[model samples]
Target: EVQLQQSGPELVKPGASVKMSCKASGYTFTSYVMHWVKQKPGQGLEWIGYINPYNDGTKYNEKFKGKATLTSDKSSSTAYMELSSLTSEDSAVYYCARGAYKRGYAMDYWGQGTSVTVSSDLVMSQSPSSLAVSAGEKVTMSCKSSQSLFNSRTRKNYLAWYQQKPGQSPKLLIYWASTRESGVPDRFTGSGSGTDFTLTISSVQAEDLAVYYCKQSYYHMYTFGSGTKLEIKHH
Candidate 1:
């Protein structure tokens, strides 16, 4: 089976750096270039770059030029990404994917997300501790960025809400503080913006039983809030 086994979580000191790896298998390592992506709490997916395993050839996204570095080892069939000058904004989940033609420049397989916590500035404070609700009830939780994620020029808050279940990478739910990802059920609503933000479930259900985390981005400044978990109400 095709698989990209990634390493575990990394909580680094502020101002430090991290280099994580993804071992590729199930296909020709050199056939497909490995791609690197970024997952910030509130923002959408970001493409960091890609590396050609056999030739040591690599390319990076414009924004990641100085922040992300890509490398690979053909003999070992592993891909690596290093983020330097760590700061609060650098704390996020990094994923390594593989694809060829790279097929419309799209990814085919995903690596287990490697959690990287930059510490401090991105420290998120969330609310309600925990919520207990019935299938038909409503539930809401909150999170605060360092200050605010409001962008005047765009007239929108740059933040997102992610839901994570056990033993898996987080999945995106809402972005821009209120817009649901393409298929997100209408039951999920993003409220508030600026410094105060809330993620609400209009009609709580068993599917909503997971930890919801919020993160905000102000240009290059991004921070993750502590998450809030939701549980089903007991009879």
Candidate 2:
């Protein structure tokens, strides 16, 4: 079995920084990629980004681009994240997860959580305003953004998608420019790049009805689309 041991809770002041670690055991630490997640008290989950321990390559949610940094230690089988320039908006629980990249970008194992609190306030929203789809019919949803992710050097899109049901924490469904999470049903497909992207549910199901969101992990100012409400259409 794989296990992730995380650091303890943190109490930091605004404008400061905090660093946390995840020590992995029971598997080849460098074999899988590690992703970070954020959850505010009584709020939903947000994808922070990931690091390729094999090469030390890193990616971040556009919003968290500069605010968060990912590093790893192969000899010790550990991954690290440093959150800088904190604020009340940064107060939340942080988690580390293992992802099987080749099979699907699915997060398999997770650490308990490290809580951080900054005495401030934050604001955010999702997109599409609202939406409705029919059963067995294919529909596409979008997460619109106010900014562009066009990189003059790499020319790659740093985007991701997520699914959140009522009263449940959001689950990462796609990341790193459209890679599906492991074990995610084939019916759910993601495609798009830069400032534009779509999450298509091939065959919509009753259980699939929920709020869908798009996240841009290309930079430090992480932002989520207002969110599209996926609902079943009645005949």
Candidate 3:
């Protein structure tokens, strides 16, 4: 029931910018907040921010103050994120997830994932490739069972999603059901109820590359999906 589907990969050059998306379905879209995360090759994850779609409330990580933007549409049940001033260092995988608040902060749900590769010779798809969903549109994405998160114990069901490039640590995207991170992009969200949930990324970006996976630590040992790779198609 809980799932997340992300856009394809992106290729950008230095001084360029890229955006990404996450789509949701099943549960009430506005009921939870969405989080955005970043992971570069052979590096750890960095929290970008989060957004509450219903009220459009937002928060960003100090590191992403001017680097990222988060927004969403309740009517369409979708969330969006934008990255600016991208450089070679910015090339990494971006993910959408749900924020969970327990006694403290945590992640509960996650989306499949999208990757954006930042470079100077950036060339996006000219044919208008898909994987992009409108805001508030009901959508579905499946994190791999082997790598994704979900436990048969505890029953808390706090499966979330994250991003891990070639040589990076996993970053938190969604947590505690459907709360977003501090500075995640908008247009990203988590939906569904109980065991059935979804994490959605709205659009694709040029800096997003690598693979994504989901994680859950409520009931069982922390687990994640094998991850989905993101790539860009051009002529």
Candidate 4:
């Protein structure tokens, strides 16, 4: 089976930068495209873009245009993403996955995710204390940040949402301003933008008792909201 082993978590100063690695194994590395995804604590996932390791060709999400750089080293079968000029918004977990060129764009296999935290005094948080819902109930979790994630010039809110269960790595539920990632269930939806956003679980399931977060990627400010833990309410 193919595998994407990512580097450990990172913690850097607000103004500094960090580079993380993803080593590919058990398959021909050059034949597949490697794509990177970003997730912050309680925030959703953002698609930073992908690279063709064989030719070094690249494509990036407009939101991360100049903020992120993608590169690969063929000799070691490894791919990398360097986040520069970090800030509180840049604090989050990033992941790399394998994408087959012929099968369309999809992250079939994913890395464990490398955490990145940019130390800062400002913080983002989620509301309603904690969520209590039984299976099959409709629930919405809100996130509010101290700073503005709204881009007045672009008229876009670079926001995303994520789900993190205890002992398991965070997964992207929505990204790129409100788009759902491939294979994400329709029941999980993200709405609102700018400083106020919500992750709605239309029909909560037994396995949905985990923390959810919201984040923004505007103005090179990549910050995530404090998580809202989901709890199972008994009948």
Best by lDDT: 1
Error of 3 at 117 (Å): 0.9
- Per-residue lDDT of candidate 4, residues 61-174 (tens digit): 999987899999999999999999887888888999999756676677899999998863546788877868987889988877676666675465668888898888888889
Question: What's the CA error at residue 120 for candidate 4, in Å?
Answer: 4.8
Write the residue-wise lDDT of candidate 3 on 1-235 in tens digits: 6555666787864466777778877667777788998888788878899998879999999988888999887777778888787766678888888775641456567876678786421111111122433334433354433232333443334666665556788667677546677666664575544444566666544434435555554321455554556543332
Error of 2 at 6 (Å): 0.4
Candidate 1 achieves a global lDDT of 0.85
How would the candidate models be sorted by lDDT, starting from the highest?
Answer: 1, 4, 2, 3
TM-score, predicted candidate 2 vs. hidden true structure: 0.50
Please give each candidate's TM-score: 0.50, 0.50, 0.49, 0.50
Please give the range of 10 consecutive residues that has the lowest summed lDDT in model 1.
217-226
In Å, residue 221's CA in model 4 sits off its true spot by 18
**In model 3, where do residues sit more than 4 Å from their true spots?**
102-104, 121-235
Query: Cα deviation of 99 in candidate 2 (Å)?
Result: 0.4
lDDT of 2 by residue, 1-235 (tens): 7899999888865677999999999989989999999998999999999998999998889989888899999999999999998878899999999999665889989999888987511222345677787778887887655565545445656667788998899999988657889978988888765566778888898888888887776333566767888888864
lDDT accuracy of residue 220 in candidate 4 = 38
Clashes of each: 3, 23, 75, 10
